[PDB]
Write an enzyme that holds these catalytic residues in place. Structure first.
Site, PDB file in Angstrom:
ATOM      1  N   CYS A   1      41.874  45.308 -23.428  1.00  0.00           N
ATOM      2  CA  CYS A   1      41.418  43.900 -23.618  1.00  0.00           C
ATOM      3  C   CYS A   1      40.479  43.519 -22.468  1.00  0.00           C
ATOM      4  O   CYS A   1      40.389  44.215 -21.475  1.00  0.00           O
ATOM      5  CB  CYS A   1      42.646  42.977 -23.643  1.00  0.00           C
ATOM      6  SG  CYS A   1      42.169  41.267 -23.274  1.00  0.00           S
TER       7      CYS A   1
ATOM      8  N   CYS B   1      42.112  39.877 -20.524  1.00  0.00           N
ATOM      9  CA  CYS B   1      43.444  40.271 -19.981  1.00  0.00           C
ATOM     10  C   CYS B   1      43.232  41.124 -18.727  1.00  0.00           C
ATOM     11  O   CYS B   1      43.792  40.868 -17.679  1.00  0.00           O
ATOM     12  CB  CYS B   1      44.201  41.086 -21.034  1.00  0.00           C
ATOM     13  SG  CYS B   1      43.889  40.387 -22.676  1.00  0.00           S
TER      14      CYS B   1
END
Length: 105
Positions: free
Chosen positions: A32, A35
């Site tokens: 991600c 993230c």
């Protein structure tokens, strides 16, 4: 220091190897973006607090630990000690890691 858990096997041996030192596990998606953007903070304490054990689990490579840990909301930071969960909290609050780490330090 830091230790990437590639499977549930290294997970248990990592807790026993830590001994009695703190053990904060960070469950995030390295793949991600937003993230992995919180890595210059959590994974950064490695150079600031060399007396803390930080584990980096990838909910994609170690999906075995993510399933057993029931992680359904990343990023999620858990606090383990001697192999016992003594605290945990989910949220992109990098400043909380400090107040929390200084809690069970």
């Amino acid at each position: 220091m830091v230790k990437q858990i590639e499977s549930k096997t290294a997970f248990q041996e990592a807790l026993d190897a830590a001994g009695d030192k703190l053990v904060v596990v960070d469950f995030s998606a390295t793949w991600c973006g937003p993230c992995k953007m919180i890595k210059p903070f959590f994974h950064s304490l490695s150079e600031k607090y060399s007396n803390v054990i930080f584990l980096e689990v990838d909910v994609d490579d170690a999906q075995d630990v993510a399933s057993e840990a029931e992680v359904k909301a990343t990023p999620t930071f858990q606090f383990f000690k001697k192999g016992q969960k003594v605290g945990e909290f989910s949220g992109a609050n990098k400043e909380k890691l400090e107040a929390t780490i200084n809690e069970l330090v």
